[PDB]
Amino acid sequence: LEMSLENVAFNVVNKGHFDGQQGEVPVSIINNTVYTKVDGVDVELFENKTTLPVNVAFELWAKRNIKPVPEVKILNNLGVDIAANTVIWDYKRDAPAHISTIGVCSMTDIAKKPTETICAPLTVFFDGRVDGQVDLFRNARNGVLITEGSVKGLQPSVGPKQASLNGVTLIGEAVKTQFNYYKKVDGVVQQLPETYFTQSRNLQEFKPRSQMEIDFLELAMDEFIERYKLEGYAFEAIVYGDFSHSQLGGLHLLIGLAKRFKESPFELEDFIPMDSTVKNYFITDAQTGSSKCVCSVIDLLLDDFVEIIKSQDLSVVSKVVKVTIDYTEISFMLWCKDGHVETFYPKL
Amino acid sequence: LEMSLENVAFNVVNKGHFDGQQGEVPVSIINNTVYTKVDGVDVELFENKTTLPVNVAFELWAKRNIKPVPEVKILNNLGVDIAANTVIWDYKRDAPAHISTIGVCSMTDIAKKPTETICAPLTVFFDGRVDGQVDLFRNARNGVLITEGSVKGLQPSVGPKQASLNGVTLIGEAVKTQFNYYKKVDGVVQQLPETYFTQSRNLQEFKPRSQMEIDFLELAMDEFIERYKLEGYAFEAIVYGDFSHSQLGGLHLLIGLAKRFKESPFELEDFIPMDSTVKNYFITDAQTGSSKCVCSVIDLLLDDFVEIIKSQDLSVVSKVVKVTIDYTEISFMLWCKDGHVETFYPK
Amino acid sequence: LEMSLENVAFNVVNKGHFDGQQGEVPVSIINNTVYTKVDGVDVELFENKTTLPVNVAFELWAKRNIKPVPEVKILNNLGVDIAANTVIWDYKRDAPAHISTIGVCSMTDIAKKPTETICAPLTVFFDGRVDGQVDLFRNARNGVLITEGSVKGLQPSVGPKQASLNGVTLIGEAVKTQFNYYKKVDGVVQQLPETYFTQSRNLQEFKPRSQMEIDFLELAMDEFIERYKLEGYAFEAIVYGDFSHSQLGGLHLLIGLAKRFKESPFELEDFIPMDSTVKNYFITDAQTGSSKCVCSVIDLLLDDFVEIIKSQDLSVVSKVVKVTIDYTEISFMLWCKDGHVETFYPK
Amino acid sequence: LEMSLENVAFNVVNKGHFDGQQGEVPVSIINNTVYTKVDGVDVELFENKTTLPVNVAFELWAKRNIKPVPEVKILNNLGVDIAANTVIWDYKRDAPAHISTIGVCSMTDIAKKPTETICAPLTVFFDGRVDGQVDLFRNARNGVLITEGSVKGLQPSVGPKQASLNGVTLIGEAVKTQFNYYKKVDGVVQQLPETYFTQSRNLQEFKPRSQMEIDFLELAMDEFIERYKLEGYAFEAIVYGDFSHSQLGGLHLLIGLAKRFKESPFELEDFIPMDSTVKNYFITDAQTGSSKCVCSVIDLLLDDFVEIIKSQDLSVVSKVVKVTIDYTEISFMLWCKDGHVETFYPK
Amino acid sequence: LEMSLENVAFNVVNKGHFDGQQGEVPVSIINNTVYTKVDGVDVELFENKTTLPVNVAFELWAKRNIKPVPEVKILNNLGVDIAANTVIWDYKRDAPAHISTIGVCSMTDIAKKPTETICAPLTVFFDGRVDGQVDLFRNARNGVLITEGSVKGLQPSVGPKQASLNGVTLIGEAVKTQFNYYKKVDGVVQQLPETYFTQSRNLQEFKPRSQMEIDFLELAMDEFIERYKLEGYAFEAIVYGDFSHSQLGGLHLLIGLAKRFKESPFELEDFIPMDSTVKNYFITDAQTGSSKCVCSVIDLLLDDFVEIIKSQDLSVVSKVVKVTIDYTEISFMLWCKDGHVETFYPK
RNA sequence: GGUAGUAGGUUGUAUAGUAGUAAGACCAGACCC
RNA sequence: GGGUCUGGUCUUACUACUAUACAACCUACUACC
């Protein structure tokens, strides 16, 4: 079996997610909200924040994938257009990460299996923890496959250490959250470029993941530069930031935001609540009054960022550097002068 | 079994009403409307005009009673509060005639059978064409029963000739639309008073049902009064109406409205779109410009109104007359000038 | 008093319009609709078709002016921006004809009297049938006044014969629907130029109002032109229309539309459902398949149009003619070929 | 170009449809409606009856095709999935006939030209009155092409005489509404089989289009059968209908509905307000009280139906017959009693 | 430019605010939300919390002023009715601080320049960081001007040290957030009276801004009174509060709320979520169970409050004191028992 | 495969119009000396 | 006159988007050989 609204609301009440049980409960749809009658009084179950019909969004929300899944920004950069036999929920905007589905909800299904002709000119995200998905990936023309283990005959690419889990990014210990990504385009397997993976942290629950980050969060600006020999790289403005003018200067690393936040709180107004490798923030410092309209904030490991900034020659007046980050080319504006860098920020 | 929204929408697509088939179709709920996907394009099935939730109203609309059922105004006057194992749809306002149901929709059900203790202090409408409903009526404490035939041990009351059928009032010929009404209050059967029944016609599809009405619609005002001896009864103003002043005078019979409509069209703005014995209209005549704020329009057979107006006993200046219409008392405001009748309109 | 939502809904139930009685009834607001509880079941009272909040629109709808009032297109052309102590309801779009009010609804009131300083730079519509409104007009800086009779010290301008009444346009007989319009700008009384008034008819309920119109609707095209000597005026295309090409030719008079409609039905899709002197229609003929994107249809008396078309002074190839219609200037695009008239249509 | 909401609303105000002019007007989006500010007051331009966003539907509505276009049922049966560089508006449900577009609205565009790789596995409707569309059809892998004239190297198929025009079906005289249909599947041109075309009439504006229909609407049932020798074909029940039982018998031709409507009015409640070759109606006769839950009503020319019914080869008790109507297969449920025909109705 | 919805949404995506760039992006309006299509999936850009149409509010939200602007409570007390060539966004209620605009959005614009006749009887907020605004202020009849520097020929009034910046109140260091306010009424420049400015702090992110506040938050109640000689001023109840009875006693300073919050948490339910000098809170203490229906909480610097309370001149039993706070008069209800102060709270 | 013709994706050129979170310069305004 | 800070413009170097014009590559559809 039964695929109906009242059966879907039964599983939410008893199991929090669509498991596949049989049962029905009263459902009342008012505005975009989906209420249910428990003990004679209406209890709200879900408020629709999406662009889909009220009952369509609720059915996709219940059938979301609760297993550790790749972060949405990884999928978007890989070119994933639809998810096979599952729905990947984007908790940043409370909407499905893909407009269409495959064998999930009859209202939005474009097919019942990922092997149909309609799904051929689409990159389909194939899981690896579900039996039979690996075989479907080989036969599919365009698809992206993730596997905790290894797949014979294919060269794996090690993905990010952290992965999304019910909207919470974490480096799994009990459950392995490090997947191997395989990309197949036009029936030909393509190896993914050697890239640096974003850690995808946040200011509030910020914890360093390396010795260099711990020194950055504890030592002074001058001491940190001297210890790691960062002279002549504009590390004072690129990462620490310049809270001295009417507009913010630099501050393009999420680690730099965390250090400033602990000193003085501020608000990061995100005008595009989606998940992407490069985030734009409307940063407004609450102490110095410094605000910047667009602030390209990219969360990179401090060890990798030092390696990146030291792998580029600084003789040119300016240059655009293409760096593989999260399996995509990020445009870095390397504005330098006389060897010493002036700024280094991404674009998105 | 299955009682779900997608199963209900399947029966509407294939059978127009909830029959009880098994199947499911895609359903999209946008605004108060309930759309379905047919041939890859959304097709509207129902727009919610009610006060109930979107899916609750749609489930009641599909489970409506398609058999000939009494007009809603009859049920309201009889004191009916809920319908047993069925939903009586009021097409005048596109909403269920009763707020609660019995064993219809789990969202609004107050019980699954009409014999529970919660339904005891409520007048429940019991059908007669469904087997077992007659037995439930006897055991029920408060209830109203309709039967095409006769029920042993009970004194029937002959109801109106016409009955509602999918929102269309008609005097059935192939199907008998004349029921016998039984009322039971506090466990004691009460006989219903002898009453006149409203014909419940309309201006557009107006057809006379007696010889006197045909003469009224064809003959002149003076000729009709002379033939039936209606002198000294204010029939010129009560029924024909007075389209000569800033406000309309009289015109309190639906038959009088029909005659004027054929001569000159006008609009009857009903500010309370419900079904009742006495209707109030915001009548605005389009020829003479005469408008009346409140116009109590009651549709009565012209033979009965003449019978009532001749039994009126015009001897006092003002009097309120209680007339049993549709199993209920209706107060008619009567004003009589010395010599004749001035104005006779319901309140 | 008391000015509250539940008191306003009481007057609608009992009197159809806000009279000023004291009382309260249950009110439930769902979506844009305003329901009320009568006999235990919700009954819809009003559905909001405006851009205003649900309860604000319902309060303005109940306080609408039910007396014969000027058509909305007259007020818009006169420059009326707000109505004093009343609401003029525009039934074409089911929304108030003016965004703001004066002493009507506290949610939208900009003042409680039309004499305040805020209302000074606004043209306020002053009635004449309400006592004291004439005095307010004299003291007001900008205002438009209508009076059934005459006002001392002011030169009246005779308005249109027909006037709106509960959304129905009519030439009143019992109630005088011909008003005298007075316009005052910047504290100086301005007279209004002589104008031809549009009859504002419609295709369905079309009735000729002159002998010439009766001949037009009955006689043939050639016979009508010969009798009234309309040769050399393009009357075959301007009024009758040309249903022979891929696009419609002419047909810019509502009387011409009516004659074609009786012969062959068609649909007039109005993409701007408002009331104005010149109407644009998306006409699609159902017989010949002729359709025109924009068709400027103006309803004028055929006698007046003949007078206008014979006072055009056809001497130049092209000329724009300013004609005072409904107290406003209308630009008519005139094209004349050497010898006769080619095409004369409004812009 | 400029493609924005405020530019689209400018063309509707000035030209009724998106022509491509440059300009902007104020736009206010409230509920599903799209209002505009004209003379300081909001005027409704369009109410969204579709599932698309408010501004997306309004942009598609303005960019609709106003030229004579094939009826939607023809396109659906031909397998058309998207329209190239145009939007075909389905006036039956007030929604676009195709979910996606090509180079129309950036919100719903899947491509800017019909030659892209994404549009290859889709049947694209190519016009013929627009220059360059014929060349695109040849290069396209899947597509359907209509042409008023002829195309070299392709075998034309004569389409229906009538065609939609702003929601009005008509047999064009000034503008040729008879197109030649070409279907190309997988890069191989396929010839369209011969078929009969539904006239798509309606009960209210019903006009016979042949001598046989005139006899049907005028002569009696017995006389019509005798004249055209329809004995032994159940024409009394199939077309005329049987208004004698609790359920309606037969009445599966729209011409039969029209004859009954003129005799006695009734209501056809359509529970799926879409446009299709076979329509299902919830017919309720207002005279005899006969109602049928599902009534498959197909509007066919009476001359063609006589030819269809005689070509049946009545030799088995029950058989499903596949008939090519409107470029699609229609399954007719045939029941034959030993000796004659019992009932022949579509499913 | 171009002023359209799709161009406005382009600047939000690329620059977070309307800068004036040229470009268009897909926009979908569902409910009150304004979505955009990025990488094939809809991304929410703005949810309308105002009373304005969906697209009108989104256009005003994008065109908000991101520079340091005066707090909304300062503007309301100064009598500001409209903002010239900019929109001042009130982040407390997520709605524009002024109903109308000037040259911002064509849907709500009452003029394109602040020098028009319509804007004359309105106090217009003129910026000082935009070139040419100072000249417009001189020519304007009613207006309020803020300037970081000084303006020749006018006497400046030093404003509050803190100013709003993207909804965050702060004392700017890199950017000067201390403005000079000029008020002009009826063409005559009026000097503003000396006043005390509210600090506008909050319980969670509470940081003392003076030595006296630090002593208040650290030292005991008795010790703090003795050190600053606050005996005979009811400082125990006015500021510290009395959490001993069924209703809260005193606690009318935001600094007093902060000290209690650190000791025992509680909830301040604000039933009027707007920004004003005097705030009313539905305070419910979670430890002692003490709750007060209305608690007038005004955030004042403790140094300034001590100066006020030491200049109160406690000599009468009851007196209403007018104190100039935030350029407006505030009535403080003062009750004094013989010998000391009983209660001193604002009304 | 060629010619006589109509075309879509990739790339390049030309005339243009905008942008880019760094820096420099010019003009205007404000503050201080 | 100098310093600092804002509003407007230009420049530095590299790239992105939109409009028009032209060419090349990969190739698509008809007429004839």
Domain locations along chain C: 1-66, 67-192, 193-347
Return the number of other C-beta atoms located less than 10 Å from residue B339's C-beta. Answer: 8
Rounded CA-CA distance A319/A312 in Å is 10
Q: Which two tokens stand for residue B219?
A: 């003959």
Instruction: Report the distance separating Cα D253 and Cα D261, nearest Å.
Output: 13
Check residue B325 and report its DSSP letter. Answer: E
Range list of β-strands (E), E78-219? 82-83, 89-90, 95-96, 124-126, 143-147, 157-158, 163-165, 168-170, 180-185, 188-190
Residue E74 is encoded by which pair of tokens? 């300062």
Q: What is the DSSP string of D254-296?
A: HHHHHHHHHHS-EEEE-SS-S--SSEEEEEEETTT--B-S-EE
- Is the Cβ–Cβ distance between C333 and C346 less than 8 Å? yes
Tell me the one-letter amino acid at B143.
G
Q: Beta A124-126 vs A82-83: how paired, if at all?
A: parallel
Structure tokens at A120: 């051929």
- Which of B106, B108, B112 has the most A C-beta neighbours within 10 Å, making it the best mutation to test the interface with A? B106
Distance between the alpha carbon (CA) of A87 and the C1' atom of G7, Å: 50
Q: Are D84 and D127 in contact (CB under 8 A)?
A: yes
**Chain A residue with Cα closest to D121:** A118
Secondary structure, 3-state, B122-187: CCEEECCCCCCHHHHHHHCCCEEEEECCCCCCCCCEECCCCEEECCEEECCCCCCCCCEEEEEECC
Nucleotide nearest to E131 (CA to C1'): G7
User: Facing residues of E285 across strands?
Assistant: E266
- Centroid of chain to Cα A119: 24
Helix axes A211-218, A302-309, angle to 10 degrees: 90
> CA–C1' distance A244–G5 (Å)?
12
> Which sign, positive or negative, has the C-alpha torsion C87, C91, C95, C98?
negative
Residue C43 near chain B (CB below 8 Å): yes
> Tokens standing for E146?
């803020």
CA distance E242 to E247: 9
Strand, helix or coil at C245? coil
Q: Which residues of D touch C265 (CB under 8 A)?
A: 205
Cβ-contact A202, A278 below 8 angstroms: no
Six token digits for residue B205: 């599809």
Tell me if D166 and C294 make a contact (CB, 8 A cut-off).
no
Q: Which amino acid is at A239?
A: V
Which DSSP symbol is given to C139? Answer: H
CA distances, D256 to each of B199, C151, D301 (Å): 31, 65, 11
Q: How far does the CA of E155 sit from the C1' of G3, in Å? A: 27
- β-strands E168-170, D295-297: how paired? unpaired
Residue position matching structure tokens 């009088």: B256
Task: Let me know how many helices (H) and strands (E) chain E has, helices first.
Answer: 9, 19
DSSP A192: P
Polymer length of chain D: 347
Which of A53, A117, A121 is the closest to D118 by Cβ? A121
Cα C280 to Cα B186, C196, C238, C273, C308, distances in angstroms: 66, 19, 15, 10, 21
Q: Would you state the structure tokens that stand for residue C24, as one six-digit string?
A: 């309260």
C-alpha dist (Å) from residue B243 to B257, B291, B337: 12, 9, 21
Residue E202 phi, psi (nearest 5)? -145, 160
- Residues C251 and C240 sit within 8 Å (Cβ to Cβ): yes
Nucleotide nearest to E148 (CA to C1'): F30
Yes or no: say if B207 and B255 are a contact pair by the CB < 8 Å rule: no
Residues of D in contact with C282 (CB under 8 A): 16-17, 166
CB contacts of D32 in chain B (<8 Å) are: 31
Contact A271 E12 (CB under 8 A): yes
* E5 in contact with chain D, both atoms CB, cutoff 8 A: yes
> Could you give the CA distance from residue C225 to residue C216 in angstroms, rounded to a whole number?
9
Judged by phi (left if over 0) then psi (alpha if -120 to 50, else beta), residue C103 lies in left
Give the dihedral sign, CA D147/D148/D154/D158.
Answer: positive
Compute CA distances B251 → B184, B229, B238, whole Å: 37, 19, 5
d(CA D253, CA D276): 14
DSSP state at residue A198: P
What is the chain A residue with the closest CA to B54?
Answer: A29
Structure tokens at E84: 């010239």
Separation between Cα atoms, residue B195 and residue E30, nearest integer Å: 55
Nearest to E174 among A96, A245, A267 (CB): A245
Q: Which helix (H) or strand (E) element contains residue D329? A: strand D328-335
Under the phi-then-psi rule, with left for phi > 0, alpha for psi from -120 to 50, and beta for the rest, what region is D166? left
Alpha helices in B186-275 (DSSP H): 211-218, 221-228, 235, 254-263
Q: Name which of A97, A274, A282 is nearest E38 (Cβ-Cβ).
A: A274
Place of tokens 């063609």: D304
**What is the nearest CA distance from D35 to chain C, expressed in angstroms?**
8
Rounded CA-CA distance E75/E88 in Å is: 10
**Residue in chain D lying closest to B12 (CA):** D271
Within 8 A of E5 by CB-CB distance, chain D residues are 4-6, 27, 55
Q: How many CA atoms lie within 13 A of E104 on its CB side?
A: 27
Residue C152 to chain E, least CA–CA distance (Å)? 33
Residue of chain A whose Cα is closest to the Cα of E169: A286
Per the rule left: phi > 0, alpha: psi between -120 and 50, beta: everything else, D293 is alpha
Tokens 């669509």 found at: A18
Q: Which residues of E touch A269 (CB under 8 A)?
A: 16, 166
Any chain D CB within 8 A of the CB of A53? yes
The CA angle B35-B38-B40, to the nearest 5 degrees, is: 105
Which helix H or strand E contains A307, and what residues bound it? Answer: helix A302-309
Residue D9: other Cβ atoms inside 10 A: 27
CA dihedral A263, A264, A267, A270 (to 10 degrees): -30
Helix (H, G, I), strand (E, B) or coil at E80: coil
Helix/strand/coil for C223:
helix
Rounded Cα–Cα distance for residues E156 and B117 (Å): 79
The Cα C29–Cα B222 span in angstroms is: 51
Measured CA to CA, the distance from residue B128 to residue B175 in angstroms comes to: 14
CA nearest B33: which of C55, D5, D95?
D95
Tokens of B145: 């029963």
Bridge partners of residue D318, in order along the sequence: D335
- Report DSSP letters for B55-118, one per residue: HHHHHHHHTB--S-B--HHHHHHHT--EEBTSB-EETTTTEESSS-BBSS-TTTBS-SSTTSST
Q: Strand F closer than 7 Å to the CB of A249?
A: yes
Long-range contacts, A219-227 (Cβ 8 Å, 24+): none
Name the nt closest to E24 by C-alpha to C1': G18
| Cα B287 to chain centroid, rounded | 30
Instruction: Tell me which residue of B9, B2, B41, B4 sits closest to B25, measured CA to CA.
Output: B9
Rounded to an integer, what distance in angstroms lies between the CA atom of residue B326 and that of residue B329?
8
How far from A291 is each of A152, A245, A298, E66, CA to CA, in Å? 52, 9, 18, 9
Q: Is E26 helix (H, G, I), strand (E, B) or coil?
A: coil
CB contact at 8 A, E84 and E288 = no
Q: CB distance C293–D19 less than 8 Å?
A: yes
Looking at CA atoms only, how far is residue A10 from chain B in angstroms? 12
Å from D292 to nearest chain A CA?
A: 29
Long-range contacts of B128-135 (CB under 8 A, 24+ apart): B128/B179, B128/B180, B129/B67, B130/B85, B133/B84, B133/B85
E43/A246 touch (CB, cutoff 8 Å), yes or no: no
- The reply to whether residue E107 touches residue D5, judged by beta carbons under 8 angstroms, is no
Q: Which residue has the tokens 């006015």?
A: E238
Inter-residue contact E198 to E325 (CB < 8 Å): yes
Nearest-Å Rg of the Cα atoms of chain A is 23
Beta-carbon contacts of B216 under 8 Å, excluding residues fewer than 6 positions away, are: B208, B224, B239, B255, B259, B302
Class of residue A222 by CB neighbours under 10 A (exposed 0-12, middle 13-18, buried 19+): exposed
Residue where the block lists tokens 């009560």: B238
CB contact E121 to C (< 8 Å):
yes
Hey, which chains touch B, using 3+ CB pairs under 8 Å? A, C, D
User: How many CB atoms sit inside 10 A of residue E246's CB?
Assistant: 9
Q: Are D197 and D308 in contact (CB under 8 A)?
A: no
CB-CB contact of C33 with C55 (8 Å): no
Residue with structure tokens 């110095």?
A288
Nucleotide nearest to E149 in CA–C1' terms: F30
Give B66→chain A minimum CA distance, Å.
25
**How far is B228 from B215, CA to CA, in rounded Å?**
10
CA distance E205 to A287: 12
Q: Is the CB of E150 under 7 A from strand F?
A: yes
Q: State the Cα–Cα distance between residues E296 and E257, nearest whole angstrom.
A: 12
Q: CB B44 to CB D93 under 8 A?
A: yes
Q: Which helix (H) or strand (E) holds B189?
A: strand B188-190
Q: Please identify which residue in the block is written with the tokens 């059968």.
A: D225
* Strand F bases contacted by the protein (CB, 7 Å): 6-9, 17-23, 28-31
CB contact (8 A) between residue D5 and residue E4: yes
Per CB-CB distance under 8 Å, the chain E contacts of C51 are 53
Q: How far apart are CA E293 and CA E281, in angstroms?
A: 8
CA of D153: nucleotide with nearest C1': G30
